[PDB]
Design a protein around this ligand. Structure first.
Ligand SMILES: [Cl-]
Ligand SMILES: [Cl-]
Ligand SMILES: [Cl-]
Ligand SMILES: [Cl-]
Ligand SMILES: [Cl-]
Ligand SMILES: [Cl-]
Ligand SMILES: [Cl-]
Ligand SMILES: [Cl-]
Ligand SMILES: [Cl-]
Ligand SMILES: [Cl-]
Ligand SMILES: [Cl-]
Ligand SMILES: [Cl-]
Ligand SMILES: [Cl-]
Ligand SMILES: [Cl-]
Ligand SMILES: [Cl-]
Ligand SMILES: [Cl-]
Ligand SMILES: [Cl-]
Ligand SMILES: [Cl-]
Ligand SMILES: [Cl-]
Ligand SMILES: [Cl-]
Ligand SMILES: [Cl-]
Ligand SMILES: [Cl-]
Ligand SMILES: [Cl-]
Ligand SMILES: [Cl-]
Ligand SMILES: [Cl-]
Ligand SMILES: [Cl-]
Ligand SMILES: [Cl-]
Ligand SMILES: [Cl-]
Ligand SMILES: [Cl-]
Ligand SMILES: [Cl-]
Ligand SMILES: [Cl-]
Ligand SMILES: [Cl-]
Ligand SMILES: [Cl-]
Ligand SMILES: [Cl-]
Ligand SMILES: [Mg+2]
Ligand SMILES: [Mg+2]
Ligand SMILES: [Mg+2]
Ligand SMILES: [Mg+2]
Ligand SMILES: [Mg+2]
Ligand SMILES: [Mg+2]
Ligand SMILES: [Mg+2]
Ligand SMILES: [Mg+2]
Ligand SMILES: [Mg+2]
Ligand SMILES: [Mg+2]
Ligand SMILES: [Mg+2]
Ligand SMILES: [Mg+2]
Ligand SMILES: [Mg+2]
Ligand SMILES: [Mg+2]
Ligand SMILES: [Mg+2]
Ligand SMILES: [Mg+2]
Ligand SMILES: [Mg+2]
Ligand SMILES: [Mg+2]
Ligand SMILES: [Mg+2]
Ligand SMILES: [Mg+2]
Ligand SMILES: [Mg+2]
Ligand SMILES: [Mg+2]
Ligand SMILES: [Mg+2]
Ligand SMILES: [Mg+2]
Ligand SMILES: [Mg+2]
Ligand SMILES: [Mg+2]
Ligand SMILES: [Mg+2]
Ligand SMILES: [Mg+2]
Ligand SMILES: [Mg+2]
Ligand SMILES: [Mg+2]
Ligand SMILES: [Mg+2]
Ligand SMILES: [Mg+2]
Lengths: 174, 174, 174, 174, 174, 174
């Protein structure tokens, strides 16, 4: 209600867009958590797939926390919503999880690009710089890594080859 | 569907109760995350309250991950639900957050005690030992610490005394 | 007069705006110097307030020097004006100095945002990047820190409570 | 042909502009290589001019490699063209080489500024940030250093003074 | 207004003279700052002249801070005035800057000698000792160093010899 | 034009042959650079193939620089030509790149053997020794390594087996 003493050049629309991005980062954390423990099942048993996705889960929680810090730095107010359960599901294989992660990271990137366009439209260079510095190249590198992983699994003969996913687990994710 | 090759003495009801406890631990992680960033606001500005609740948030995620590992160890199947947004809210003060945390940790403890009673009724000593070893004394210590904190804040004159919450932030949580 | 051999895509208006920002950074250095020695008076005697503002004074001189380096890097010509004596004055209390610093840092931020808008209008991405990298987030962090300090001093009971300012001097600025 | 699985918000025109910039960086590497070995001639014999330009040659190859990495990160396709032999030539003196390098680095900067304007027109903030972070300030510093070197050689009395170029070789480039 | 609890044998006239000397030291800091960045220009490009005068600028700020500390130690009240922009200007050469610095340091010395004569007339031995200990020999050494530098630049053939200023920059200020 | 003061027993034809070999070494550097970034594509994604060919690219630039040094040591004059874009192309697979590299290194070897025959015909033992010491055995080892790599990839079932190229990337080039 009462205006923040710190708030300056921070549009109400940008404040709301940051709250939506916090929810998306927490959702991405949850998707990777679910994917991690699929690979920990006794009938899947690919421990480096499990470790890879758990690390990715922890990284998304860090991405959400940094946006929460930004909201307070600019004098906005954090508004939280439910974190939806992962949608994608029936994980099925290493290849199918990697394809789900690729799609997730491209959707997160599209959200960030819309956020950047809003910050540009409201002439908020601090928020533009925040998104560019901490998010956009991190998304480009994540998308490229996931594409590389999908390519290798497809060339090795996944998902039909259980040997392909086993050897990728050792040699790329190990 | 098809029975796990590892499953032994693990009742369907226990499997479902563990899924419910995973959701509760993730919910508790979310409540502490919300409480943390309230204290990071420029109009609250109690950085050791913020750090204390963030650490508590991270600990609840570890509690959820260990239950997910247990579900797979016993040959159950993880089933995830939405993580509800925190309920409590309007954080208002250090004292009121500490009282909300005390109530949260007592509800989590009551859930664990119901889980233990189910495991006892299904003669599952491994699950009883898991809950006793990793959860019950961790809840007793958390509840005692939170009661201690509430007592000190009340005796110091919180929430009316902004000096009380400031000095508690430095001397107890610093 | 004669065109710099280094100058490229550097508008006369941007050159003049950088000279105005150099003067403002030197003015901010002078305001913090004055505020520092107020707290060194024998009838004020808050040594960590004094040290805090002296450090802030030295940081503003660094901000001015970096803009002088930028002017020469781009082939502009530094033009200096008098550094006005601090306006605000009658320092009165730790809280009132912190409020003056908050207002100063918000005015400096507004100057930087106008500078960024000019650089954007003249399609000068190097100057936009310079301002974003070295100034805009440094202003957001300074404003947030000063708001946090004002909040704590108000909650502790400043300026009426000499005990509040004494204890803030030890515990936050010490 | 078939769309990259990684490509997102990456305009065909930006892809082609990056290929043109790769060629220019390789061309700049070649110009500095040629300039280096001129100073290694027995009838020129200025070993620190030779070392300075060789280092600059190696740096331009790094600039080209980073753009090739960017093209693949964004899901574009590298397209290579011949690397033209250096144009400028008849090196003649330390001063004349430094003037050729100044002109080269200003042309490379103008190419980067056109690339940035295209990325801005296609609302590609990742590519704008890439150019700003890795190229624009590196060009401003190179241009300023080369201007400084040209100024000193002119003031010392180059190119007529072989003593000027000898002493600059020892004291500035040594 | 109300007499300091610390003030003893500290004449109103001495208090005012110390305020005037604070302004002069800040003015000298500003003159050296301006001189420093002249040598950082791409068409001057004498980096050790730039570093020498920047160090001298920082030293004058220390001289001003020590006088501000003295004013408070004795129970006087600091009164600040605008810091005038440097007068001298059109820097023109290393030799002309060194001559301006020599004239500045002789004017500062004359101010200190007038301050000492006032302190002697008011029988203030503490203030006499302060000026003698911290200022008078520091001025004699600065004046002697600047004379030495002017002599060498004149003998080497400055300002006509750009080679003289270049070699002095390397060998004396390097 | 005017004869070098250093030139002795260095035939005009040898001087021209060395200039042609400089161009070929730069061309080989460019072929390996192109091959490297093919393996960095998201739809190829063999990072140790990429690293192997990038190292080979850097080694060819060193081979060109050493010939440029030789030309100056003997008092010849470096004459540069355009560096043609790689010819071979459509890289297609690890095996096909390795076969292109084998063919490249055999053509470079044939050029060196023609250079040696010219140096022998002009009774230039220094140039014969230079070629033998720095180039001929380096070509024999490169050709043997590339043949070994082609053999292994063929035996493992490349190019049809994406598993063969993946495992060769880890075990031979990793
Ligand atoms: Cl507003
Ligand atoms: Cl919202
Ligand atoms: Cl909701
Ligand atoms: Cl990458
Ligand atoms: Cl990167
Ligand atoms: Cl059963
Ligand atoms: Cl369930
Ligand atoms: Cl649900
Ligand atoms: Cl306890
Ligand atoms: Cl205990
Ligand atoms: Cl205390
Ligand atoms: Cl112009
Ligand atoms: Cl101006
Ligand atoms: Cl003025
Ligand atoms: Cl902050
Ligand atoms: Cl930050
Ligand atoms: Cl204490
Ligand atoms: Cl498209
Ligand atoms: Cl193209
Ligand atoms: Cl071509
Ligand atoms: Cl620079
Ligand atoms: Cl810089
Ligand atoms: Cl010398
Ligand atoms: Cl008196
Ligand atoms: Cl006065
Ligand atoms: Cl004034
Ligand atoms: Cl002396
Ligand atoms: Cl002495
Ligand atoms: Cl001959
Ligand atoms: Cl030739
Ligand atoms: Cl050609
Ligand atoms: Cl061998
Ligand atoms: Cl061998
Ligand atoms: Cl292995
Ligand atoms: Mg959403
Ligand atoms: Mg990640
Ligand atoms: Mg994320
Ligand atoms: Mg649902
Ligand atoms: Mg970055
Ligand atoms: Mg529940
Ligand atoms: Mg806990
Ligand atoms: Mg818990
Ligand atoms: Mg609800
Ligand atoms: Mg125990
Ligand atoms: Mg102004
Ligand atoms: Mg500051
Ligand atoms: Mg500043
Ligand atoms: Mg005035
Ligand atoms: Mg921008
Ligand atoms: Mg930054
Ligand atoms: Mg071109
Ligand atoms: Mg360079
Ligand atoms: Mg370059
Ligand atoms: Mg041509
Ligand atoms: Mg930068
Ligand atoms: Mg005066
Ligand atoms: Mg001095
Ligand atoms: Mg002084
Ligand atoms: Mg005036
Ligand atoms: Mg005496
Ligand atoms: Mg002494
Ligand atoms: Mg050829
Ligand atoms: Mg090789
Ligand atoms: Mg070679
Ligand atoms: Mg062609
Ligand atoms: Mg040998």
């Amino acid at each position: 209600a009462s205006t923040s003493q710190v708030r300056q050049n921070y549009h109400q629309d940008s404040e709301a867009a940051i709250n939506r991005q916090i929810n998306l980062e927490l959702y991405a954390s949850y998707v990777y958590l679910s994917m991690s423990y699929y690979f920990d099942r006794d009938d899947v048993a690919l421990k480096n797939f499990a470790k890879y996705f758990l690390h990715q889960s922890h990284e998304e929680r860090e991405h959400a926390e940094k946006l929460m810090k930004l909201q307070n730095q600019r004098g906005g107010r954090i508004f939280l919503q439910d974190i939806k359960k992962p949608d994608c599901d029936d994980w099925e294989s290493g290849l199918n999880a990697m394809e789900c992660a690729l799609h997730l990271e491209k959707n997160v990137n599209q959200s960030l690009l819309e956020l950047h366009k809003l910050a540009t439209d409201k002439n908020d260079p601090h928020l533009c710089d925040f998104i560019e510095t901490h998010y956009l190249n991190e998304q480009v590198k994540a998308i490229k890594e996931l594409g590389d992983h999908v390519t290798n699994l497809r060339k090795m003969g996944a998902p039909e080859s259980g040997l392909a996913e086993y050897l990728f687990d050792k040699h790329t994710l190990g």
